[PDB]
Design a protein around this ligand. Sequence first.
Ligand code: HEM
Ligand code: HEM
Ligand SMILES: C[C@H](O)[C@H](O)[C@H]1CNc2nc(N)[nH]c(=O)c2N1
Ligand SMILES: C[C@H](O)[C@H](O)[C@H]1CNc2nc(N)[nH]c(=O)c2N1
Ligand SMILES: [Zn+2]
Lengths: 420, 420
Amino acid sequence: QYVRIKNWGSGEILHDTLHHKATSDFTCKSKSCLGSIMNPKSLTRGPRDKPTPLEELLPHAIEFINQYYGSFKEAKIEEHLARLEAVTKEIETTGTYQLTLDELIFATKMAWRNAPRCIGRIQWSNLQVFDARNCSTAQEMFQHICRHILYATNNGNIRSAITVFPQRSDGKHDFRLWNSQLIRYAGYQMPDGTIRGDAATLEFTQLCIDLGWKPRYGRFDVLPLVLQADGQDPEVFEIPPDLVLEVTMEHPKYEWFQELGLKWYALPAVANMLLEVGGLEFPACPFNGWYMGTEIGVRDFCDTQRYNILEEVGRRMGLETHTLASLWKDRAVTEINVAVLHSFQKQNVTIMDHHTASESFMKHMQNEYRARGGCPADWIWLVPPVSGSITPVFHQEMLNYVLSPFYYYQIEPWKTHIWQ
Amino acid sequence: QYVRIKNWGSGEILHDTLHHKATSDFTCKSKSCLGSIMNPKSLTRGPRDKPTPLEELLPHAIEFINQYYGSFKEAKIEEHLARLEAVTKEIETTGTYQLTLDELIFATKMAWRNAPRCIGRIQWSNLQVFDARNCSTAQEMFQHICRHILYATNNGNIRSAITVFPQRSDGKHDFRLWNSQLIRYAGYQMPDGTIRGDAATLEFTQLCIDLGWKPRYGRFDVLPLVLQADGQDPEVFEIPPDLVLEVTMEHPKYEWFQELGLKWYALPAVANMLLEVGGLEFPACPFNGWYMGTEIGVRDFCDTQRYNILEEVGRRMGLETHTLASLWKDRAVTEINVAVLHSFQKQNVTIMDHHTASESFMKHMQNEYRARGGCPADWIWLVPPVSGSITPVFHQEMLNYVLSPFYYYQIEPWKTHIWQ
Ligand code: HEM
Ligand code: HEM
Ligand SMILES: C[C@H](O)[C@H](O)[C@H]1CNc2nc(N)[nH]c(=O)c2N1
Ligand SMILES: C[C@H](O)[C@H](O)[C@H]1CNc2nc(N)[nH]c(=O)c2N1
Ligand SMILES: [Zn+2]
């Protein structure tokens, strides 16, 4: 029938009918909840040896073409019927099929729409699609990615975009970006026991250096693009510095803040995800939106396993840093966040604070239920890393499910790559 | 086999074998996660008409006696064997069985140990058990509850305790406390459109007044105990004011804070939950621990649906209250929290800040996995309503499951009570 969902802040009740269209088995079990797991098999789509079995491809394909044509106000039935026949003809002829640019565009926005862990989804229809399905060399990959970065940045006025490379064919000719993010800082373990830069990119920076990247041993060293084209080994490309736009941090009160020598790139671009749509799969399709302050201020800067700056931001604020109960950490993190938002605001670079983000998502969630009867949502990811219950999303009960199209995680490439 | 769990902050990995001992079907489905739902059927144990089917009672009973005797270092096998026989003899003779005080004590601590939504579980073995299984009248219920409140309070030096009333027999002679909490404030809808006190207790305060309670139309009016004994209708009892200990709020810097006229009761006591153990069920068994600042500071005070004080605490702090992006809400909530912790600390009343709480739970979680191979945990409840990722629990992946004994929710009594 339907599932009842309540918003404990507003008292409003909603009915979820959309979960009925969910793929196959998800994260949890009959006797336990595992929604707390970061990378479950259910959110991951791995490698392939042989092409996709046609008995599987065709129904998926037909369902996608049905969804696409079922999406315009006053559909084109003769076009719909023609497309179904052509797709079937193509599947039986070539072993697979090609999406029209229009279908791809629709696929990319819908997969974003279906991303349960994204707060920015109110923006789902504003997405620029770069068709790089004709690509064949790593060098061409690199050029496409540069156009992306250039377009996306727009000199601070961030624009959301995605660039789709060739779809998986047999499974041994996959196009992959070995980077987690398009733009990201390096993390080196220093001689003195410490770690500089991004502790999260440790194992990867080591891979980059092993493929011959020149380690600039600093704290904000933008790592290189590590591209895998067709079946080939990955090639290393340096990101043109002119393309990488950053924001240096500074507080509108605490003038000693900038003396911390902190900054962050203005571009949040997921590089290693896979787009599934109508039986097809694209293992290389980097995408970007704009940042939400907490990503940088709370997670990037304050996480133990990342930059870890809390200890000294507390010190430099006076604060009893050795008395947990004093709530210094609460004090600092709040200031590190106004810095980020001020620094981004001042330097004319798009940013979104978590409160306005949460409020926009709530508006989106209502639009979604009204428009299609549901919105797949992952509360654990959707609730900001700070000020939990101060945001509307905390009081909203939600359902998490995998629809199609969708953006999946992939098993990291170095673990499955057959080098030549 | 076992489930792999990772702590993304420390890199530590853990194996969960305990989830194999989980009861029956939990919250989620084959195709979707619903761990975000507040009151799912899986966390609730409802009404009964007829006694418990013996085919069900006996295995459950035997399993509990096996667990109990399997719990002491160097067990008493002849006592274990004797207890199994006696329990079986009693079940076949009287239709049910009675727990020894020692087994009850063990049951109450283990059910607490198994509460996936409790952060304070490191304390699980320090629990005072009040045996009120001999009780028969509402007046005796009221006396027991008063002894509880008195003992628990200890004049600020809060002590954890539970008071167990008679177990469900046929299902139509249930002992129930109609209150959500032992001590709790009233919420009235005022003439001027507003609402005073606790907006959460609206529908209930109306029930109290309908059973003849005298509405003192204030903002901190401690509601009456509404007791249901044997099968009978509920009787209303006023909580002796001398028993109710409160804490008035005041900031160690902002002297205008106390002029807000704010306070909160020093006793967090869940009144409406059901204890299940070895086939048996106790529908009345109120329990208490001590408070965690955020409960009062963030949830009680700042929630829209509760006291809702943010708007004016912001105003009285200067803050641009009409500019979301200014992060005023972050600023205020932090101060409302130091107040609570200071006010509680000054007035010599036990309290625990969320950071130290999170750290103690993490230590408990490790002790648990080491001791029994798991710890049922609900990330959505365990992560504080503020400073999410600043706490260790946010980075800890966890598994949520229902073991036995356990504390269940119950369908609210007014919805199922056959009045006489
Ligand atoms: C327009 C601005 C957007 C904002 C403000 C936004 C914000 C966010 C935030 C805050 C996260 C969590 C990041 C993390 O904790 O790792 C996220 C994740 C995500 N976003 Fe959005 N997003 C936007 C646009 C997009 C776009 C354009 C796409 C795809 C076309 C997208 C796809 C996703 C996906 C798949 C995730 C999950 C990533 C993962 O699982 O690691 N987002 N987004
Ligand atoms: C010793 C101090 C303790 C602390 C600091 C503590 C703290 C907490 C906190 C912060 C919550 C969440 C409250 C909410 O958000 O509604 C909670 C819930 C809970 N606690 Fe503990 N607790 C303690 C002792 C106990 C005891 C003694 C029991 C039982 C014998 C217990 C049983 C539970 C249960 C069942 C819940 C879930 C309540 C619900 O689902 O509404 N706690 N505790
Ligand atoms: C273990 C836990 O799942 C993990 O720390 C989470 C929680 N919620 C999150 N939320 C977001 N948006 N991003 C994250 O990285 C995480 N990680
Ligand atoms: C909808 C959502 O489940 C709800 O707001 C939650 C989340 N986590 C919580 N955590 C605690 N400890 N207490 C709560 O009341 C809640 N409620
Ligand atoms: Zn689940």
